[PDB]
Design an enzyme around this catalytic site. Structure first.
Site, mmCIF file in Angstrom:
data_model
loop_
_atom_site.group_PDB
_atom_site.id
_atom_site.type_symbol
_atom_site.label_atom_id
_atom_site.label_comp_id
_atom_site.label_asym_id
_atom_site.label_seq_id
_atom_site.Cartn_x
_atom_site.Cartn_y
_atom_site.Cartn_z
ATOM 1 C CD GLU A 172 35.099 43.144 47.721
ATOM 2 O OE1 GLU A 172 35.758 44.189 47.878
ATOM 3 O OE2 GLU A 172 35.350 42.336 46.792
ATOM 4 C CE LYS A 177 36.772 41.229 43.507
ATOM 5 N NZ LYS A 177 37.157 41.372 44.943
ATOM 6 C CB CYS A 219 37.081 44.804 44.745
ATOM 7 S SG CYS A 219 38.734 44.755 45.468
#
Lengths: 317, 317, 317, 317, 317, 317
Positions: free
Chosen positions: D46, D128, D162
């Site tokens: 990430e 995201k 995530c």
């Protein structure tokens, strides 16, 4: 389509200046008078509810503000009591009615023409495309999606107003709809014979010159200083008459200052003679020239899927 | 619409911090006193039940957890005792009241405003569209079909809080629906003057700018360490006051450090003659710009045809 | 709402296989013992009345037909003695009870959970939404109007079985109802740990993971041949334990070989500071995705205005 | 479809903190070596360019705001040198590449994944769908029209970041499109195997579980005071593995403290063996539950028919 | 309506077991030969591409999973080549064609018919509703939207499959659409005479009854061990026939063990003699009993407006 | 809820045509003989009291009126001596009996089945939903609230007549109430085999197919021309038999067109084997199809609070 024959009427009159509740009832007496003679269509002059704003160009831009405040409390709205008393007056006489208004929408203000059917229902409305020099600081802007022509029992109806007759693009747009009978309302000051007579030749229709008269209370309201008062007397007065598609009058002329009505036979079958000589939207055209006519409505903000809301009544809590 | 004239009031106060059952009673002792002067509208500052979360500003994302665990037990559900007492306080005085709170739905907190009318029941509620820098850890997201403005006997009214005044499309979303009196609420740390001054001019609206004060009840709990208790003394204080549609004060100013109230005469007819200069959603627009305002409820799951179960009670079996 | 503290128990046991009248007495003595420790809630493995259909895994679709003929005679058929014997036991002590069984109505079997309150009445039932792979041909289909959660003295309660934890829609469908303590049951075999464990993290709830064990009588009549026997003896053993909203065990695990009970002492207010990180049905969501949850009960044939017939009798005629 | 077979590699590494030029050059070393061992696909942790914002998890808004200033000047943009430098390696070595970075557009930052294909060019991006607990200060929010899966050469590719693995509807919106080889990128702290192993079972795919490590450079620029230093060394560190659709790892666990690589054979035909048991969007469903998925492009301001302007030259004037 | 007259043909045949490219090529020469003799309609047995899953009820669930792995790769998708190879063979001869096959769809697998029209195009498709006793492991369930009856140049056409003739609600739903000529594909094992003679009378329609036969090549692969080699000799074989609207056979029974064709002459206005006695949806009805039919697409996720993608090329980058 | 086993019987016979006084005596000697063989249920053919109206099928509407005048004098008129003589015969023995007759209410005739129970009482009544093609002009009309399915010590009982077996949703209306043993009554002339055979397969009951025979005495009073008689001899012969849930006969058929009885063992526990394959009102169903069974007694006129009246006897007068 079909080609009817009928009697039509045009009205020269004035409102009770800047008062709506008197002026709507004056229109009811005057339409019951007009329709008593058996005329099938009736049309009123420019800005008849509640009146044309002469104060906008006698004084400087600051003088207007104090009078605008008294106009804005007397404009009409779509569901207003001022509509019911006209809709019943059409329903009680079975005639087509054309009337001019100042409308209040979203806190802004516009000039409109408004039409009623013999069943009493509202057919549609038109908005002034652009304001002239007296109007530009009183009334809001037009829209292209609000330029109708109506199929009816009495042929294809429509109607511009005021300075719109000087713009050729609107002549072409209205003629593209195949109109046949066309109202044309003027306030009174602007010079109006020559442009309305050219329009009759250019689109081959009957036309109904309709206009207002000056009165004593409106000048006692609007003048204050002597050089405003004796300046107002400069303005020319209007007149009303109706024309054939050849460009000569068919009616008599209403006397050039008094209140009154003119009417004549209309025989719309006769229009076919003049479509032989010219037709701007048909054979009398060139492939080298065109026009883009957008027709979708674009309000400044657009609501999608409008819905209501819920309340917790005091008995519940 | 009717253009009323009436007296309005705005209150500068602090809640009994992080306690709901004490704080709701203090609000009752304020409104029952503010009503003695005959003011018909009353408005409270930001997040008044239980109180604004200062602990988010002065510690890392783990430090806020221990206080969130105490906030969550004190948030307001819709059918709670905390709303029954406000409904009595409105009904017994016949005044409109606007109050702000942490509202709890399902598993999540949100920030809301509630409006009660003279009959004692809710007119509706509004939800914060987006969170500012600090509290975005704490409160949930907004919705776009949850920003009403209400027709009522005191003329069209609604309200906003915090940084909402910094977003131009949201300013347009109130003006789109013709608001005329407005409540703007602030927690007092942000600089509340210059953006509320501008909103009054941009929409021509009376603005009841209303703000909180700090007190010792914060200091003995929010900051544990010496450097936190030092840093917390940095913050500015608010300026509760009423602005006209000219962009200038009509009320006095409440002094910048104490509890108290301000009030003034409101004469809604005076909004008309400022529309003459500027009207962002009316005649001042252009066809090259527009807005897509979609307003339909969209929760993450939508229940259809709610039903109730049946119980085989012990006597049958 | 209010947050309780209490002791909960999870029971690892086996029924007297395909014998309802023996199996209900075994279920009674387990509750009569487990309530002695003061536990407020007790839960049981999948299909405890009369037993889980292992024969579907070890033979072709004709082999099962001879055993289905016995299962159909031993289904619970509410109301019956199999309900009265449990309803008395839940009132003899004072606990909630969750028990799962094969339920018969009309012509078809279903699998269901039954929930009893401390007053001895049924709170409601839940039907398995879809079968697995092997029992796909033994039990009937689910319904969408039979996914309740129950609001109680010990918080919000509900439960699921088997592969339901593998379907992402159902996690959302339970989370939107706001559960706080949760029952999950497994027949062993399926490798349950990580699929159960994840549900605790995703919905922030205490999970009472519960499962059954194999016996001698469960295999001695079911294994007609050695190639079935030496296959069936390969199956994986189960577990029974309590997981917190942190994803870690609070209890011990019951030993993998034997009957037994696990219990822990639980504190429901402890969910709040895990709910701080994520809430999938609240603020942790996007406008671009939404669920339709049709809660309308639609049986295949819906009786309207149910009536009771009336008869002549031998004395009258 | 085609069901191909290949070798793939997951990379465990740390960037040169908040330096773009050093960190992009570090990737050109690392891709070329990883491809030299025969791998057809590689993946990265990430926010690998420029680096994950650990400074958000300590201090308060005034502490983080002075570091944001140096992150903002180092962010990548869609047509920059940083993409040109990566595209060399994807061309030369004949591999796919997946890399995650903090791109900017307008005034604003995001977090995104970039996919490149062996012809040399960018095949798409993913943005995201929601910020994590401390990230909500830094990055802007995603959109539903930027969630693709790519149909080419090595099955169907896709990926998530995530806590997107914690939200049940993101699993659902992906399985509806039939992905088959999946990338899952994590930061250091709060890296879990449980939310990864459940996803492998719930969608039946191979999974490239990938994470970053802390480095010696971080401390004396992340933490300016002793308390922050002694706190920050407490955090856990991440893992890296390849998981089969069995829920079992198919590679060695790479050490918790090294710039390692894990690589293994991938055999896409082996997946259909388990697609038999369940499919959450296929045969394992009922009509009572369904999802509304809207994917129109929704920029806040959308250009329409934008053009390029005319100019006058200083030679002309 | 029109009431046409034509010759129709019913096919009895066996596919090359589990091989798609062999089986589809046999179907071309068989459609051609049958059409060479003047037949206007041709209809095929159940699951002719690639073949029926007889292995589903010859062993326990572990034995079948290794065969599903080889069935799945040989299924038909919507734009595939097997459809292209059939569509040209319809256009070459100008005959309507009905065939049935394993439709792969996303990750899932279904059993469906395909109907082709003389211009060469698809008319539509039909899916099996709820699978039979052993089959409900392999295929997924249908949906109520895909229930067509086609207004066509040979009168109204449609067709159920297998045990759907045992369910009275499907008889009502199809008869409500006023069908005239009907096809009934069977797998060749169940009792299919009584199950179709009744349907002909209950609907007043000509029916084509068609079934498949075993061949020794399949027994050399679906049953390795001796017990199933013996057991799979005990099954029945199917009939092929055409029946008139009085439930009378109109052409010769095809022999019970050979591939071949039955021919008959269809004379649609013969049906009017029988609507005089019974019509279950017209005059033979009562007000107290009625049926609710819900016709609406039910995908588990419904894609809204789709969107394309942009790739920055290796010459732009 | 229990599964009994018992011996059952069905009879073929004819009444003394249009004479009630002898036909009740014939029914009595048949019950008193049939019960002597030890059977526990006895069933009779169509319209047995006083006889089926063959005089409706031949000759025009003005002719049939001549015989209706005699039929109307001989209807059963409940309660009457005609049922009292059956109730005694069903109490002398101990058997359920089902008898068919023409009932009279007020001014109109109806067709009914009467059920009598071993205590001698009348447990309920069924009435025909709609008439056959000829009898539409003789008998009245059905209602939806008279669909009994009696619970008994010999299992759940009910029974239909004539073409009711050819209205598909009517099978569902019985199957909804879990019937187990069913009596099917026919007048002869119609093809009764395939429609009763299919009903046994579709809803899995045993079926008692029962029908009447011609007597010569009826035709010699009906026919007066030669061609009426010569036409009458074209009619089809009768049948009587018992069918199992497998769709095959358990009894012999009655061997010729002669008065006589058939009987068999009935073992109701054996139905469970077949509910494993299919259950149309339970698990073998879909969500897109339903039924509206409204069972409300609505006669044309509904009495409310029926009471008697006083008589002024000759004492008071």
């Amino acid at each position: 389509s079909i080609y009817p024959k009928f009697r039509a009427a045009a009205v020269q009159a004035a409102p009770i200046y800047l008062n709506l509740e008197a002026s709507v009832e004056k229109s009811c007496e005057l339409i019951d008078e007009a329709a008593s003679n058996g005329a099938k269509l009736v049309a009123f002059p420019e800005a008849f509810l509640p009146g044309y704003p002469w104060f906008a160009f006698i004084g400087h831009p600051e003088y207007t503000r104090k009078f605008y405040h008294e106009l804005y409390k007397n404009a009409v709205e779509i569901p207003s009591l001022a509509i019911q008393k006209i809709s019943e007056a059409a329903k009680r006489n079975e005639t087509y009615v054309c009337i001019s208004c100042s409308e209040k929408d979203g806190g802004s203000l516009y000039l409109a023409q408004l039409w009623f059917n013999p069943n009493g229902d509202l057919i549609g409305k038109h908005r002034k495309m652009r304001a002239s020099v007296a109007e530009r600081l009183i009334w809001g802007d037009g829209s292209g999606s609000m330029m109708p022509v109506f199929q009816t029992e009495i042929g294809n109806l429509g109607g511009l107003m005021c300075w719109e007759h000087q713009v050729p693009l609107d002549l072409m747009a209205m003629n593209a709809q195949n109109e046949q009978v066309h109202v044309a309302s003027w306030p009174g000051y602007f010079d109006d014979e020559i442009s309305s007579r050219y329009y009759a030749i250019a689109t081959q229709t009957f036309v109904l010159m309709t206009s207002s008269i000056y009165t004593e209370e409106m000048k006692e309201m609007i003048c204050l200083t002597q050089e405003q008062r004796d300046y107002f007397e400069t303005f020319k007065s209007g007149h009303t008459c109706i024309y054939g598609p050849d460009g000569e009058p068919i009616s008599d002329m209403v006397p050039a200052e008094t209140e009154g009505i003119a009417y004549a036979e209309i025989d719309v079958e006769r229009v076919i003679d003049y479509k032989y000589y010219i037709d701007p939207a048909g054979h009398y055209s060139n492939q080298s020239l065109s026009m883009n006519f957008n027709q979708q409505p674009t309000p400044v903000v657009k609501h999608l899927n409008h819905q209501k809301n819920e309340v917790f009544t005091y008995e519940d809590i």
